[PDB]
């Protein structure tokens, strides 16, 4: 009685939006090296730790999304020549669609895929994504396999699979490139994607992770000793 | 058209906000929910579950 329990609700517990990745994309003369003219990022939440460890109180969940793209830039020379204001093309790719291979393919025509043109310097981009799951809820911690090796198989690799994985490619990629043609002056860009869940419903609570993460699994290698030193009968 | 006037606090990105935001994939047929057991309506149905504490933290 007379205590507002509204700050601890689920829709208020996921109110903040934490980063999920940082993507390098560069604009230089095309070299023989690994050219960062366009960059790609597999859509996942298990890249950072603070959003991952927060979502894994819960086994199943369903929630909308609200992404936000914050773009910075730099130069690489001291009194480098001036450059005009640049335009970025963020592009979503569903699973199965053709992946870009060069800076300028036939696939950057965005004829079906939704894409966001972001002039540098303005307010950040801010788009929403509905519940794009195919079950009735997203499934953290899938237990089984994807394939089952049968007795009648020829060799081992046919029935081979990967433990605790539902699909090889979940939710596709983003494909960020710079629309302007390259220059003798090069401008290093670092896109940061934020993520804020909305309309959150969760189920089946579970205790949180308390050794540091290691890979996209549920395993562990290092720092297996979390609790500190403290006496038994000392206040 | 309409004489608006910008106030301070425009073009920023505050993280804790509840603004409207344009959808990227319109006309989407959402999978309907089912009655999965054990729905958590609030963080207080996690603290009130009785859990064990570590007591004897000597160095051995």
């Amino acid at each position: 009685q007379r205590r507002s329990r509204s700050e601890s609700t689920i829709e208020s517990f996921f109110a903040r939006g934490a980063c999920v990745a940082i993507i390098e994309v560069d604009n230089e003369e095309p070299t023989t090296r690994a050219q960062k003219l366009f960059a790609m990022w597999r859509i996942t939440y298990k890249d950072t730790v603070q959003l991952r460890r927060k979502l894994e109180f819960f086994t199943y969940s369903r929630f909308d999304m609200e992404l936000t793209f914050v773009v910075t830039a730099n130069f690489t020379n001291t009194n480098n020549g001036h450059a005009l204001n640049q335009v970025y093309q963020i592009m979503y790719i569903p699973p199965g669609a053709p992946t870009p291979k060069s800076w300028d393919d036939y696939t950057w025509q965005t004829s079906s895929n939704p894409s966001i043109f972001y002039t540098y310097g303005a307010a950040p981009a801010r788009i929403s994504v509905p519940y794009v799951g195919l079950a009735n809820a997203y499934s953290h911690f899938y237990d089984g396999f994807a394939k089952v090796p049968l007795k009648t198989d020829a060799n081992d690799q046919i029935g081979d699979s990967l433990y605790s994985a539902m699909t090889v490619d979940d939710f596709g990629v983003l494909a960020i490139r710079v629309v302007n043609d390259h220059n003798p002056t090069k401008v290093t860009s670092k896109v940061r994607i934020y993520m804020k869940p909305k309309h959150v419903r969760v189920w089946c609570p579970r205790p949180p992770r308390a050794v540091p993460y290691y890979g996209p699994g549920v395993d562990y290698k290092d720092n297996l000793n979390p609790l500190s030193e403290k006496g038994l009968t000392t206040y | 058209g309409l004489p608006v006037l910008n106030t301070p606090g425009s073009n920023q990105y505050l993280t804790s906000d509840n603004y409207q935001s344009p959808c990227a994939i319109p006309e989407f047929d959402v999978t309907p929910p089912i009655d999965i057991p054990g729905e958590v309506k609030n963080m207080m149905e996690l603290a009130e579950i009785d859990t064990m504490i570590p007591l004897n933290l000597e160095n051995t």
Partner: peptide, 17 residues
């Protein structure tokens, strides 16, 4: 003292909390 919420977009995920 109250306020006003007017949903502007047609999509369900576009609305506010």
């Amino acid at each position: 003292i109250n306020y006003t919420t007017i949903n502007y977009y047609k999509d369900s995920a576009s609305n506010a909390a």
